[PDB]
Every structure is written in structure tokens, then in C-alpha cells.
Amino acid sequence: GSHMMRSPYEYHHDLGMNYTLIRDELIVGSQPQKPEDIDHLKQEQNVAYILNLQQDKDIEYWGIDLDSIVRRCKELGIRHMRRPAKDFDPLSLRSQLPKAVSSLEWAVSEGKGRVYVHSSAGLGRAPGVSIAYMYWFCDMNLNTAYDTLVSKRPCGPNKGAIRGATYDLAKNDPWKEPFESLPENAFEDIADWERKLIQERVRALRGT
Numbered sequence: 001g002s003h004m005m006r007s008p009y010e011y012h013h014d015l016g017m018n019y020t021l022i023r024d025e026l027i028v029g030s031q032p033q034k035p036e037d038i039d040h041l042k043q044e045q046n047v048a049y050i051l052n053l054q055q056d057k058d059i060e061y062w063g064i065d066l067d068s069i070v071r072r073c074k075e076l077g078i079r080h081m082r083r084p085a086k087d088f089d090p091l092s093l094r095s096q097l098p099k100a101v102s103s104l105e106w107a108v109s110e111g112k113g114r115v116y117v118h119s120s121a122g123l124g125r126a127p128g129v130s131i132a133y134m135y136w137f138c139d140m141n142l143n144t145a146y147d148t149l150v151s152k153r154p155c156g157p158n159k160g161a162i163r164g165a166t167y168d169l170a171k172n173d174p175w176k177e178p179f180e181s182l183p184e185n186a187f188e189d190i191a192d193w194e195r196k197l198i199q200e201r202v203r204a205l206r207g208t
């Protein structure tokens with residue numbers, strides 16, 4: 001009916017799982033709600049991996065029977081991966097970014113089909129993870145990676161968290177140069193050695 005918009009971006013769980021193709025290897029969207037959403041993704045999008053960024057309490061709140069989703073994945077040869085991060089929490093997204101990205105980049109490199117990256121709405125966590133991936137592993141800077149995502153799938157993923165994760169992986173002696181004491185554009189882009197260091201540390205998180 002008639003209604004003021006709660007916030008700038010709203011999650012309409014009642015409209016079913018939604019998603020957006022961002023690059024050919026990479027889909028970002030909301031939680032699959034049923035085993036049938038897995039079949040959809042296999043049949044329509046050649047998805048061979050699911051990266052789920054939700055906590056257990058998210059999954060309980062949204063009433064999802066994750067065991068049956070995961071069972072369907074196994075039946076269809078899809079690999080289902082969990083890397084939880086807190087909802088509405090940019091410091092949690094930041095802390096978990098490197099592990100989440102290692103799972104996504106591993107899957108893309110394995111090459112069996114597309115990767116479906118999701119959180120609850122795919123408005124916060126999953127877009128952040130995807131933007132970090134395109135920045136660190138697809139030879140862009142942070143602003144270009146950010147716009148690649150939000151121009152296709154509008155939302156306000158937290159840029160500071162991604163930039164802060166880039167610092168966490170790349171900066172020598174952080175205690176000497178705290179993130180908060182550095183110019184705001186710091187680590188919006190990276191030198192070649194930094195890009196190589198970040199990639200080595202991310203790939204070394206594989207299977208951890």
C-alpha cells in the first residue's frame with residue numbers, strides 16, 4: 001500500500017532471491033530461500049559455487065533451512081562455502097574480508113562455473129566482498145571497483161572497510177601508522193608490490 005521508504009535501499013525478502021551479474025565469473029545477490037533457488041542458479045546461470053556470508057542468527061531470523069539448501073547443492077555438484085560476517089557491522093566486514101575473498105578468488109580460479117556471492121540482502125556484505133575481489137585481483141583501483149558494482153547493483157557498501165582491509169594486508173608496521181592517522185585516500189590504490197603481497201596473503205588463507 002502507500003508507504004514512505006524506510007531507508008535508501010530496502011531488502012524485499014518477499015519478492016524472492018534477487019541477483020546481479022557483475023562480471024562473467026561473479027554474481028552478487030540475496031540469500032537463496034529454498035532448495036529450488038539453487039536449481040534456478042544451476043539451470044539459469046551455470047553457478048558452481050555459493051559463497052554465503054551470513055551468521056547463523058541471520059539464517060534463523062529469515063527462517064532458512066540451510067541444511068536442505070546445502071544438501072541440494074551437493075546433489076547438483078555445487079560447492080557451498082560459508083564465511084560469516086556480522087550484519088550492519090563494517091568493522092566485522094573489514095576483519096572477515098580477506099578470508100571471504102580467498103574463498104571467492106579460489107572458486108573463480110577453479111573455473112567450474114560461476115560463483116554466487118550472497119549475504120542476507122546482498123546490499124552490504126556480498127557487494128563489499130565482491131568489490132575487494134575486483135580491486136585486489138582484477139587490476140583496478142578501489143573507486144573503479146566500487147562503481148563497477150554499484151552501477152549494476154545499487155547499494156551503499158562501506159568503502160572505508162574495504163580500504164581498511166587493503167591497509168590491513170599491505171601496510172608495514174600498522175602500529176606506527178594507524179589507519180585513522182592517514183589521509184582519507186590512503187589505499188584507494190596500491191603499488192605493484194602491495195598488490196602482489198595482498199594476493200599472496202589472500203591465497204595463503206585458502207582452506208583455512
Ligand SMILES: OC[C@H]1O[C@H](O[C@H]2[C@H](O)[C@@H](O)[C@@H](O[C@H]3[C@H](O)[C@@H](O)[C@@H](O[C@H]4[C@H](O)[C@@H](O)[C@@H](O[C@H]5[C@H](O)[C@@H](O)[C@@H](O[C@H]6[C@H](O)[C@@H](O)[C@@H](O)O[C@@H]6CO)O[C@@H]5CO)O[C@@H]4CO)O[C@@H]3CO)O[C@@H]2CO)[C@H](O)[C@@H](O)[C@@H]1O
Nearest residue numbers: 079080081082083099100102103104106107205206207208
Ligand atoms: O557448518 C559450517 C561449516 O563451516 C566450516 O566449513 C566452511 C569453511 O570454514 C569455509 O572456509 C569454507 O571452506 C571453503 C574454503 O573457504 C574455500 O577456499 C575452499 O577451500 C579449498 C581451498 O581453497 C584449496 O586451497 C584447498 O585447500 C587445501 C589447502 O590449500 C592446503 O594448504 C591444506 O589446507 C590446510 C591449511 O594449510 C592449514 O592451515 C589448515 O588450516 O588446514 C587446511 C586444510 O586442512 O589443505 C586444504 C585442503 O584441505 O582445498 C579446499 C577445498 O576443499 O573450499 C572450502 C569448501 O570446502 O566453507 C566451508 C563450508 O561451510 C566448517 O569447517 C565445517 O565443518 C562446517 O560444516
Ligand SMILES: OC[C@H]1O[C@H](O[C@H]2[C@H](O)[C@@H](O)[C@@H](O[C@H]3[C@H](O)[C@@H](O)[C@@H](O[C@H]4[C@H](O)[C@@H](O)[C@@H](O[C@H]5[C@H](O)[C@@H](O)[C@@H](O[C@H]6[C@H](O)[C@@H](O)[C@@H](O)O[C@@H]6CO)O[C@@H]5CO)O[C@@H]4CO)O[C@@H]3CO)O[C@@H]2CO)[C@H](O)[C@@H](O)[C@@H]1O
Nearest residue numbers: 007008009010011061087088089120121123124155156157
Ligand atoms: O548509503 C545508503 C546506506 O548505506 C548503508 O546502509 C547499508 C547497511 O549498512 C547494510 O548493513 C545493509 O543494510 C541491510 C541489512 O544488511 C539487511 O540484513 C536488511 O536488514 C534487515 C535484517 O536482515 C533483519 O534482520 C532486520 O534487522 C533488524 C534486526 O533484526 C534487529 O535486531 C535490529 O538490529 C539492530 C541491532 O540490535 C544492533 O545491535 C545493531 O546491529 O543495529 C541493528 C539495526 O540497527 O534492527 C534491525 C533493523 O531494525 O531487519 C532489517 C531491515 O532493516 O536490509 C538492510 C537494508 O534495508 O545495506 C545498506 C545499503 O546498502 C549505510 O550504512 C547507511 O547509513 C546508508 O544510509
Ligand SMILES: OC[C@H]1O[C@H](O[C@H]2[C@H](O)[C@@H](O)[C@@H](O[C@H]3[C@H](O)[C@@H](O)[C@@H](O[C@H]4[C@H](O)[C@@H](O)[C@@H](O[C@H]5[C@H](O)[C@@H](O)[C@@H](O)O[C@@H]5CO)O[C@@H]4CO)O[C@@H]3CO)O[C@@H]2CO)[C@H](O)[C@@H](O)[C@@H]1O
Nearest residue numbers: 140141142143144145183184185186187188189190191192
Ligand atoms: O615510484 C613509485 C611512484 O613514485 C612517485 O609517486 C609518489 C608521488 O610522487 C608522491 O607525491 C606520492 O603521491 C601521493 C600524492 O601526492 C597524493 O596526492 C595522493 O594521490 C592522490 C591524488 O592526489 C588524487 O588526485 C587521487 O588520484 C586519482 C587520480 O587523480 C586519477 O587519475 C586516477 O588515476 O585514480 C586516482 C585515485 O585512485 O588520489 C590519489 C591517491 O588515491 O597519494 C599519493 C600517495 O602515494 O606518493 C607516490 C608514491 O609512489 C612518482 O611520482 C610516480 O610516478 C612513481 O611511479
Ligand SMILES: OC[C@H]1O[C@H](O[C@H]2[C@H](O)[C@@H](O)[C@@H](O[C@H]3[C@H](O)[C@@H](O)[C@@H](O[C@H]4[C@H](O)[C@@H](O)[C@@H](O[C@H]5[C@H](O)[C@@H](O)[C@@H](O)O[C@@H]5CO)O[C@@H]4CO)O[C@@H]3CO)O[C@@H]2CO)[C@H](O)[C@@H](O)[C@@H]1O
Nearest residue numbers: 141170171177182183184185186187188189190191192194
Ligand atoms: O595530485 C597530483 C599528484 O600527481 C602525481 O602523483 C601521482 C603519482 O605519481 C602516481 O604514481 C599515482 O600514485 C599512485 C601510487 O604510485 C601508488 O603506489 C598508490 O599509492 C598508494 C600507496 O601505495 C599506499 O601505500 C598508500 O600510501 C600511503 C602510505 O602508505 C602512508 O605511509 C602515507 O605516506 O600515506 C600514503 C597515502 O597517501 O596509499 C596510496 C594510495 O592512496 O596509488 C597512488 C594513487 O593512484 O598517482 C599520483 C596521483 O595522481 C605527482 O607525482 C604528485 O606530486 C602530485 O601530488
